[PDB]
Amino acid sequence: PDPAIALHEAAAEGPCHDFKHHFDECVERVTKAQEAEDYDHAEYKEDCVEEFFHLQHCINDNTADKLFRVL
Amino acid sequence: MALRKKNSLLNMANSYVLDSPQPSNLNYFWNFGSLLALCLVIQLATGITLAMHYTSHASLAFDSVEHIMRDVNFGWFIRYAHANTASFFFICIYAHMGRNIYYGSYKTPRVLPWSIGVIIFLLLIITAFMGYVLVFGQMSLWGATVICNLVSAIPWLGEDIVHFLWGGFSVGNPTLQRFFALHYLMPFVLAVFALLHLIALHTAGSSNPLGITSNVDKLSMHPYYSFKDLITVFAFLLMFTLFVFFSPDKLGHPDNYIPANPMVTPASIVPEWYLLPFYAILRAIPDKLGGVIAMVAAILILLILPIVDRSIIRGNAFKPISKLLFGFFICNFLLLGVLGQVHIEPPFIVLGQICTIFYFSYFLILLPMVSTIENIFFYIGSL
Amino acid sequence: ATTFYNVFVKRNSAFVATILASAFVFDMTFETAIDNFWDRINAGKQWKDIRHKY
Amino acid sequence: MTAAEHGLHPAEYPWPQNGMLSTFDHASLRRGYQVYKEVCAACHSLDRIAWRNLVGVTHTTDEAKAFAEELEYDDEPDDEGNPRKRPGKLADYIPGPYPNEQAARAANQGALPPDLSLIAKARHGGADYIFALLTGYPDEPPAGVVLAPGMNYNPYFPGGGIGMARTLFDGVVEYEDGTPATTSQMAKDVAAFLTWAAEPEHDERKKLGLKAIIVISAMLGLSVYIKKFKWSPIKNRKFIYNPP
Amino acid sequence: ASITSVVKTSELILKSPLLSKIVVPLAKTYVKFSGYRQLGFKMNDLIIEETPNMQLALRRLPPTESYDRVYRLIRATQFSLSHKLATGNDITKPEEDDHYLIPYILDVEAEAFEKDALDNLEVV
Amino acid sequence: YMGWWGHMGSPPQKGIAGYTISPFAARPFAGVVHAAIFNTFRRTKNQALFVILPVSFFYYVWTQASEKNEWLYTKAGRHELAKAL
Amino acid sequence: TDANRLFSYFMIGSFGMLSAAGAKATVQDFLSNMSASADVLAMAKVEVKLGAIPLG
Numbered sequence A: 001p002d003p004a005i006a007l008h009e010a011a012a013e014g015p016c017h018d019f020k021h022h023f024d025e026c027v028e029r030v031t032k033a034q035e036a037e038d039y040d041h042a043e044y045k046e047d048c049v050e051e052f053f054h055l056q057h058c059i060n061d062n063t064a065d066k067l068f069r070v071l
Numbered sequence B: 001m002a003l004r005k006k007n008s009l010l011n012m013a014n015s016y017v018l019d020s021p022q023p024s025n026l027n028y029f030w031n032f033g034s035l036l037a038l039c040l041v042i043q044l045a046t047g048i049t050l051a052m053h054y055t056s057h058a059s060l061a062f063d064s065v066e067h068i069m070r071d072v073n074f075g076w077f078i079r080y081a082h083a084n085t086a087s088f089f090f091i092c093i094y095a096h097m098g099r100n101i102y103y104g105s106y107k108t109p110r111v112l113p114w115s116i117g118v119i120i121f122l123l124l125i126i127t128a129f130m131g132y133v134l135v136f137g138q139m140s141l142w143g144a145t146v147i148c149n150l151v152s153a154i155p156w157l158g159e160d161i162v163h164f165l166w167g168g169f170s171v172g173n174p175t176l177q178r179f180f181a182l183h184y185l186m187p188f189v190l191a192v193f194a195l196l197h198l199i200a201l202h203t204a205g206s207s208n209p210l211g212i213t214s215n216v217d218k219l220s221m222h223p224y225y226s227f228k229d230l231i232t233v234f235a236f237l238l239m240f241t242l243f244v245f246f247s248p249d250k251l252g253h254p255d256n257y258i259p260a261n262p263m264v265t266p267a268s269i270v271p272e273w274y275l276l277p278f279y280a281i282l283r284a285i286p287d288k289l290g291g292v293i294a295m296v297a298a299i300l301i302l303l304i305l306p307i308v309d310r311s312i313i314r315g316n317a318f319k320p321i322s323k324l325l326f327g328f329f330i331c332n333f334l335l336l337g338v339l340g341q342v343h344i345e346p347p348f349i350v351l352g353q354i355c356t357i358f359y360f361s362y363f364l365i366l367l368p369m370v371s372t373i374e375n376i377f378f379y380i381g382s383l
Numbered sequence C: 001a002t003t004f005y006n007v008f009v010k011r012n013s014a015f016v017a018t019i020l021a022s023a024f025v026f027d028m029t030f031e032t033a034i035d036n037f038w039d040r041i042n043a044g045k046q047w048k049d050i051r052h053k054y
Numbered sequence D: 001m002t003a004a005e006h007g008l009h010p011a012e013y014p015w016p017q018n019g020m021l022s023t024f025d026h027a028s029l030r031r032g033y034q035v036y037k038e039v040c041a042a043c044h045s046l047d048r049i050a051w052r053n054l055v056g057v058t059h060t061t062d063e064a065k066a067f068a069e070e071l072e073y074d075d076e077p078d079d080e081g082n083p084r085k086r087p088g089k090l091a092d093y094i095p096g097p098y099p100n101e102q103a104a105r106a107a108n109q110g111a112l113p114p115d116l117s118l119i120a121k122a123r124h125g126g127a128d129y130i131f132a133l134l135t136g137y138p139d140e141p142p143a144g145v146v147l148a149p150g151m152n153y154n155p156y157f158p159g160g161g162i163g164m165a166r167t168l169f170d171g172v173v174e175y176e177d178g179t180p181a182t183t184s185q186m187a188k189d190v191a192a193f194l195t196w197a198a199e200p201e202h203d204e205r206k207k208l209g210l211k212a213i214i215v216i217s218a219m220l221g222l223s224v225y226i227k228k229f230k231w232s233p234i235k236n237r238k239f240i241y242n243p244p
Numbered sequence E: 001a002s003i004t005s006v007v008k009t010s011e012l013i014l015k016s017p018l019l020s021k022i023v024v025p026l027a028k029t030y031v032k033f034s035g036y037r038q039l040g041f042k043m044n045d046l047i048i049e050e051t052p053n054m055q056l057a058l059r060r061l062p063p064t065e066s067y068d069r070v071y072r073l074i075r076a077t078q079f080s081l082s083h084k085l086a087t088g089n090d091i092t093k094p095e096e097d098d099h100y101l102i103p104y105i106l107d108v109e110a111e112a113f114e115k116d117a118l119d120n121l122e123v124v
Numbered sequence F: 001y002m003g004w005w006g007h008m009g010s011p012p013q014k015g016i017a018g019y020t021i022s023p024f025a026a027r028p029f030a031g032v033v034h035a036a037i038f039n040t041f042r043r044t045k046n047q048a049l050f051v052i053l054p055v056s057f058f059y060y061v062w063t064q065a066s067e068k069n070e071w072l073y074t075k076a077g078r079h080e081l082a083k084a085l
Numbered sequence G: 001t002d003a004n005r006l007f008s009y010f011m012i013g014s015f016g017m018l019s020a021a022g023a024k025a026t027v028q029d030f031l032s033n034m035s036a037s038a039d040v041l042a043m044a045k046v047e048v049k050l051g052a053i054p055l056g
C-alpha cells in the first residue's frame, strides 16, 4: 500500500492542522452556499482552491523528504 | 630594430597586444573587454559548429537541435555552451558598459569608442534575438512574432515592412531561414565593430580608475595585463562550467523545448532575460509607436552621455553624489529587468512607468544637475 | 636541485617537452582516477552495476 | 495571476540525480521504462528515443533488439513498388500510439497528449512536476471548482483542469525486479525515466563537469600565484621625489 | 563644462551671504568625503586634461609646479594600483590643496572665449 | 593625446627616482593575510553605503510591489483588484 | 638560489601542464562533434537474415 497515503494523513493531522481546518471550514461554507437556491444566478461563486493550495503546499513541505526515503 | 616593430603586420599585433602602453592601475573591471572577446570567440567557435549540424528549414529546425543534443558527439556541450555563453556575453557587456559609465570612459577624448560601442550593443541584441529564433520552439516563434510586430508601428509602411522581414504573412519557414543566414553573419559584423572601437580607443589609450592621465606611468599590455586577464578568464570559465555542466537550463525558458505551434499561444511571452529591461520600457508607454520609440531611445540615449555629463572631472571615483546617483540608476535598471518578466498587473503597471521615468531622467535631468553641482562643490570645497 | 633546474627547466625546449610529457601523464592518470572516484560515489546506480543481472 | 491559474508549485523531492556528483539510478530508469511501456505508451509517444538509446542505460543490446523486432516498421517498397513492412532494428525510433494529431485528439476527448521525450525539460519543475502531477489527483476536486467536461482536477496543472485522468493505481504494473508497484513508486520511476529521456547525456555531463571544475580550479589558483608573481615589481615599486 | 563657468558660478555663491552660509559647509564636507586628498592629490590634479585648452594651460605651468604635479600623479597611480591610501605626509592637508592650475586655465579660456566672441562681431 | 614609448606625451619628468626589486627576489604573497583581512575590510567599509542604500531601497520597493500583487489576486483582495482595474 | 627560481618555474610549469591537458581535452572533445554521429553509426552495420534466401 501506497506510503504517501499515510504520510499525507499524518501531516494533515499534525504540522498542517491549521491549514486543514481552513480548507475544511471553506468546504463547509461553499457546499452550504451551493445548497442554497439562486446560487447559479450569483455573480461571485467562492471556491476552495486557495485553501487547498495552502494545505497541499504545507503537506508537501512536511512529507517530500520522508516519502522519497521509503522508495 | 626588433622584428615585432619592423614588420608591418607584426607591428599591428604588437601595437595592440604586446607593446600597447596601458595605465599601470587598471582594476579588475578593465577585464571585461577581454572577457567579451573570449565570449565572442566561444560564440564563433560553438556557433559555427552548431551550424554544421543545424538545419534552417522550419520542418527540421527544432528536430535538428534535438539531433545536436542527442546524436552529435558532444553536441550537448556545444549547444549548451553556445546558449549559456550568450547569457554571459550580456552579463559581460553590461559590466563593460557599467564600467564605462561609472568611470567616465564616454567623456572626451573617448567619445568615438563609446559611440561605436553603442552600435556594438545594438548588433549584439539583434544577433542574440535572431539566434534565439533559430531553435523554433514556442518561445522562438512567439518571441519573433511579437518583436517583429513592433515594426508594424512605423507609420504608413509598417505593415509592409513586417511582411518584408517575415518573407510571408506570419513567422514561418522564410523567416527562419533568413534569420539563420543573418544570425551567422551578424557576429562577424559585430567583430568588425568591436575592432573599430578598439582602433578608435588607441588614439587616447585606456582610461583608468582615477580618471587622470596615465601618460606619466605606463605598463606594457604584456605581460602585466596578459596575466591579469588570465585570472578573470579562469574565473569566467568556472562560472561557465557551473552553468554548462551542472545547470545548463537555469537561464533558459522551458517553453522553448516545446516545438513552435502557431495555434497555441504560450502563457507568457517574454524575451530572453538580457532584453528584459528594454521590454519593461516598452510596456511603460501605452502608445504602440511611443513604446517602440522609447525602447530604442533607451539605448540610443547612451549616445548623449558625452554631452549631458557636465563634470570637469572624469569618472565617479571621487564624486560621492554621482556615485549614489549611479547606484540608484543601476538598481533601477535591474528593477526594470524584473518588471520586464512580471505579468501586466497591478501594481507593477504604475511601478514600471515610474522606473522608466527614473531611467530617462538620469540622462536628461539628474546627471546634468548633479554633475554641475559637484563641479561647484569641488571648487568651493577646496578653496 | 640545481641539477633538476639545469636538466628540465633551463632550456625552454626541455621545459616545454617536460610540460607536454607531464600533461600526457596527468591526462591519463586523472582520467583513470576520476573514473574510479565517480564509480565509488555512484555505487549501485550505474548501468555497469546492474548489468550483471542480464 | 491567481495561484490556480499558475498551478500549485511542486515540492522539491530528493531525486537520486540531484546533486552535483550524482548519476541517475539506472535501476529506477529501467523500472520507469516499464511504467512508460505499460501505462503511458497507450497515449503518449516517445519519438526522440531510439531503441539503441536504451542499450547500456536500461537494457542490454539483446533485450532492446527483442523490443525492436516485435514491431513492424515501414520498409523501402518492393520491386513492384508495393509498400512493405520490416521488423524493427535498434536504429528505429520507439513508435507512437497514434498515426497523427487528429487521431490522438479523437481518442482523448479533444486533448492532445504531448510527446514525452522532452517533457521533463519543457515544464517548470522537471521531474518534480511530473511526479507531483501523476500523484496529485485528489479524490474530490476542492469544493467550488467547476471542471469542463472530460477534465479532471489536478492542482499542479495550470488552471487545474487536466485532460489526462489519474492512471497510476497500486499494482497497474508488475515490476520485474520485485519492487512493490505503489502509485508513488511508479511515479518516481517513470519521472526518473522521463528525466533521462529528456537529458540522456546527464550522467556523462556531470562527470566531465567534475573534471573541468578540478582542472579549472587548479588553473585559477595558479593563475593567481602567477599574476602576483609577475606583478610584484609593480606593486612593490617605491619612489623618492626631490623637487628640482 | 568650462572651468570659467564653474568659477563664475562659484563666485556668485560666495558673494551671496545666505548662499555661502549654506553652501560653503556642504562643499567642505563633500570634499572630505570625495577622498581625493587620501591619494595625495590636489583638487586641480583631477581636472580633465585631454582638451586643447587644458594642454595649453599645463604647458604654461612653472617648471616646479609641473614637476610636482607629475610626482603627485605618479604617486597616486601607485596608491591606486596597490589599493593603499596615502599616509602621513602624502595625505594632502587642506592648506596644501591650492588651486595652482585654475589661473592658467582661466587665462587660456578667457582668450579662447574672446576669440569666439570677436569671430562674431558685427560693425555697427 | 597619447604617444608611444619614448614620446608618451608626459609633461617633462625630473627628480622622481623609482626603485623596485626582481619578481624572483620578492615574496609574491608578502603580507597577504594582513591585506586579505584589514585592507579588504577598509576598502569595503568605505564603499558600503553606496551599495547598501540603493540595493535596500529597490529591494524594499520590489518586496512591497510583489506582496501587494500577490494579495490582490487572492479572495481577500477581490475588491481592491476590481478598483485597480 | 636555484631552489628559488625552480619553485616559481614549478608554478609556471604546472600552469602550462594543466593548460596543455585542458586544451587537449577541449580540442579532442570539441572536434569529435565532426566524427560520425550516433544516428549515422547506427545506419551503418546492416544485418541480413539468410534463412529467407533460397539456393541458386
Ligand code: HEC
Pocket: D035, D036, D039, D040, D042, D043, D044, D108, D111, D112, D113, D114, D116, D119, D123, D130, D133, D134, D157, D161, D162, D163, D164, D165, D167, D168, D190
Ligand atoms: C489514456 C490517456 C493517457 C494516459 C494513460 C496517460 N496520459 Fe499523460 N496526458 C494525456 C492527455 C490527454 C494529456 C493532455 C492534458 C491536457 O493538456 O489537458 C496528458 C498530459 C501529460 C503531461 C503534461 C501535462 C502538461 O503539463 O501539459 C505529462 C507529463 C503526462 N501526461 C505524463 C503521463 C505519464 C507519465 C503517464 C503514465 C505513466 C501518462 N501521462 C498517462 C493522456 C494520458
Ligand code: HEM
Pocket: B029, B030, B031, B032, B033, B034, B036, B037, B040, B093, B096, B097, B100, B105, B106, B110, B113, B114, B116, B117, B118, B120, B121, B190, B194, B197, B198, B201, B205, B206, B207, B208
Ligand atoms: C563585443 C563587444 C565588445 C568587446 C569585445 C569590447 C572590447 C573592449 C576592449 C578589449 C577594450 C579595452 C580594454 C577594456 O577597457 O576593457 C574596450 C574598451 C572600451 N569599450 Fe569595449 N568592447 C565591446 C563592447 C563595447 C560596448 C558595447 C561599449 C559601449 C557601449 C564599449 C565601449 C568601450 C569603451 C568606451 C572603451 C574604452 C574604455 C576605457 O578603457 O576607458 N565596448 N572594449
Ligand code: HEM
Pocket: B040, B043, B044, B046, B047, B048, B049, B050, B051, B054, B065, B079, B082, B083, B086, B089, B124, B127, B128, B129, B131, B132, B133, B134, B135, B183, B184, B187, B188, B190
Ligand atoms: C555574438 C555571437 C553570438 C550570439 C550572442 C549568439 C546567440 C545565440 C543564441 C542566444 C542562440 C539561441 C540558443 C539556444 O537557446 O539554443 C543561438 C543559436 C544559434 N546560433 Fe548563435 N550566437 C552567436 C554567434 C553565432 C555564430 C557565429 C553562429 C555561426 C553560425 C551561430 C549559430 C547559431 C546556431 C546554428 C544556432 C541554433 C542552434 C541552437 O539553438 O543552439 N551563432 N545563438
Ligand SMILES: CCCCCCCCCCCCO[C@@H]1O[C@H](CO)[C@@H](O[C@H]2O[C@H](CO)[C@@H](O)[C@H](O)[C@H]2O)[C@H](O)[C@H]1O
Pocket: B005, B011, B012, B013, B014, B015, B016, B017, B019, B198, B199, B202, B203, F003, F004
Ligand atoms: C586586438 C586584436 C589584435 C590584432 C590587432 C588589431 C588589428 C588592426 C590593427 C591595425 C589598425 C591600425 O592600428 C595602428 O597601427 C600602428 C602600427 O601598428 C600604431 O602605431 C603605433 O605604433 C608604432 C610602433 O608600435 C609607431 O610607429 C606609432 O608611432 C604608434 O602610434 C597605431 O597606434 C595603431 O592605431
Ligand SMILES: CCCCCCCCCCCCO[C@@H]1O[C@H](CO)[C@@H](O[C@H]2O[C@H](CO)[C@@H](O)[C@H](O)[C@H]2O)[C@H](O)[C@H]1O
Pocket: D204, D208, G027, G028, G029, G030, G031, G032
Ligand atoms: C588543432 C587540431 C589538431 C589535430 C587533432 C585532431 C583531434 C581530433 C580528435 C577526435 C578524437 C575523439 O575520439 C574519442 O574522443 C572521445 C572524447 O572526445 C573519447 O571518449 C572517452 O571520453 C568521453 C568523454 O570525453 C566519453 O564520452 C567516452 O565514453 C570515452 O570513451 C574516445 O575514447 C576517443 O575515441
